[PDB]
Amino acid sequence: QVLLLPFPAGHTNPMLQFGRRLAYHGLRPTLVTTRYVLSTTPPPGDPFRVAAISDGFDDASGMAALPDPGEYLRTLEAHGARTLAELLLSEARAGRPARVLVYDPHLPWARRVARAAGVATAAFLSQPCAVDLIYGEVCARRLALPVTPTDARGLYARGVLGVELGPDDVPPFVAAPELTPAFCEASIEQFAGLEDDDDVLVNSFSDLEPKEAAYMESTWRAKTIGPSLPSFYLDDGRLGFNLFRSTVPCMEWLDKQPPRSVVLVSYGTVSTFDVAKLEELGNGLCNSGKPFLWVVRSNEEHKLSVQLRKKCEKRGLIVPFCPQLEVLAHKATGCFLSHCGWNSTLEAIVNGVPLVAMPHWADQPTISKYVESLWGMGVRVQLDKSGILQREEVERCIREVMDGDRKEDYRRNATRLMKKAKESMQEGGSSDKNIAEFAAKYS
C-alpha cells in the first residue's frame, strides 16, 4: 500500500487528492488517521482503505483534552509512534506491507518509525514554498532566531524569494517565536532529517512561486504536486456550471444571487475570534451592502449576538460550514474574505476568485503579502495602530476588490493564476509530471 498520514485534523484532503492520483496510476492508498477520527467520521471510500493509530485519546478528541500544543504534540508522538510501528507490522502480517509512507513532516517521528521498519518515506508539505524555505533556512542553521526582515531581504536579493517581506509579512512562528514556542519548534523540525527521506513533495505549483519552488527543489529535493484538489476543479478529464453539484442549503441561497455578487467569508477551522473581533467583521460585512456567505463555526457561534445575526439577515447567510470549493466555483461568488490559510488560498486560485486577506499567523501573513504584491489577486486588511481590525477597514477592502479602480486588476490576476494552476495539474503539467514520476517509482 501507499500509506497517507496527514496531521490528525477538512485537511486530509490535499493528501487524499494526491492519493487519488496515485490510485489512477494503479497504486493502493490507505488513509491513516487516529482511532478517534476513524470511529467518529465517515471513511473516504474507494479507492482508499483506512487504518488507524492512536494519539492517546481513542474515545474523545485529544486536542480538546490537551489544548496546550506542546503537550498535545508530545502525547501524539508517544502514542502515535508506538501505534504506527504496530500498524506497519500488522499491515505486513495482513499481506499489505507498506511500500511508502507519505506523511506530514510536523510528525517527524513518523519518518523515523517508518524507516526503522524499512518503509520508504515521502514528506508532504502542505504550506507554500515561500514559508517552507524560511523555516528550512533556520533548520539548516543558515539563519538564526528570530528571523528578521533583513534576513528576508537577503533571500529576495539572492533570487530565492520573489517578494520583499516586511515585519508584518515574515512568518511569525520564526519572526516572533516567543509568542508560540511549540509552533516555532514544530515549524523548524519539519526539516530536521528531511534529507533522509526518499521523496519530498509540496502542495504548490511552480508558476505560482517560481523562485521559491526552484530553491525548494535544489535545497530539499521538494517536488511540486499541486494544487492537490479534485480533478473536476482543475478541468482534468482523465478518469462555468459545476457538474459536482450538491444539495447543501447554502448552495440554494447562492443560486438566487446575481453573478459575481457574493462575498464568501471564512477564517478557517483553527483560529478563534473574540466577540469584539466578530462584531467588527460582521458589521463590516453588513456595512458593505453586498450579499455575503459568512462561515461562523459551530464552536464559535455562541459569540454572535442576536442583534448581529439579525443585521446579517438582510443580505447575508451565516452557516457553520460550507462546501467551500463548490462555493468558490459558483457563478454568484465575487470575492473571498479569507484568513489566507494555504488550502483556502489555493482553492481561491483554482476558481479565479479575488481575495480580501485577513491573516492571523502561521503561513497566512506571508501568503497575504504574496496575494497583494506579487500575485496581485486581492488586498490585505490594514490593522490600526493597536493591531485591531476595524469594521470600516473590512468594508473598505470589500468595496475595493468589488468596486474599486483596481477591481479588474485583481480579477485579471486571479484568472491568470487559475489557468496556470489548471495547466500544472493537467497532463504534462509541471505538477502532474512529478506525480507521475512518484507513481512510477512506487509501482
Known binding residues for UDP-alpha-D-glucose are 11, 126, 269, 321-322, 339, 342-344, 347, 363-364
In this chain, which of 171, 226, 341, 376 binds ligand UDP, going by CB under 6 A? 341
- How many alpha carbons lie under 13 Å from residue 285 in its C-beta half-sphere? 32
| Annotation says 330 is catalytic | no
Looking at the Cβ atoms of 67 and 428, the one nearer to ligand UDP is 67
Catalytic residue among 55, 104, 197, 199: 104
Size of the chain in residues = 443
Of 9-17, 32-40, 142-150, 233-241, the window that binds ligand UDP (rule: CB under 6 A) is 9-17
To the nearest whole angstrom, how small is the minimum distance from the Cβ of residue 343 to ligand UDP? 3
Q: Which ranges constitute the DSSP H helices of 126-265? A: 129-139, 149-157, 172-175, 181-189, 210-220, 249-255
Asked if 347 touches ligand UDP (CB under 6 A), the answer is: yes
Residue with cell 524555505: 133
CA distances from residue 54 to 37, 96, 249 in whole angstroms, order as listed: 10, 20, 35
To the nearest whole angstrom, how small is the minimum distance from the Cβ of residue 106 to ligand UDP? 12
Site for ligand UDP in 278-297 (CB under 6 A): 295
Contact in structure between 272 and 339 (CB atoms under 8 Å) = no
Of 114-122, 242-250, 261-269, 418-426, the window that binds ligand UDP (rule: CB under 6 A) is 261-269
Q: Which helix H or strand E contains 73, and what residues bound it?
A: helix 69-93
Concatenate the DSSP letters of all residues of 253-295 into one string: HHHTSPTT-EEEEE-TTT----HHHHHHHHHHHHHTTS-EEEE
Asked if 11 touches ligand UDP (CB under 6 A), the answer is: yes
Of 6-14, 143-151, 177-185, 412-420, the window that binds ligand UDP (rule: CB under 6 A) is 6-14
Q: How far apart are CA 350 and CA 352, in angstroms?
A: 6
In this chain, which of 231, 242, 269, 390 binds ligand UDP, going by CB under 6 A? 269
Question: At residue 357, what are phi and psi to the nearest 5 degrees?
Answer: -90, 125
Looking at the Cβ atoms of 1 and 34, the one nearer to ligand UDP is 34
Of 73-81, 158-166, 180-188, 338-346, the window that binds ligand UDP (rule: CB under 6 A) is 338-346
Dihedral over Cα of 371, 373, 378, 381: its sign: positive
Residue with cell 513532516: 105
| Annotation says 11 is catalytic | yes
Active-site residue numbers? 11, 104
Binding site for ligand UDP (CB under 6 A): 10-11, 13, 266, 268-270, 295, 321-322, 324, 341-344, 347
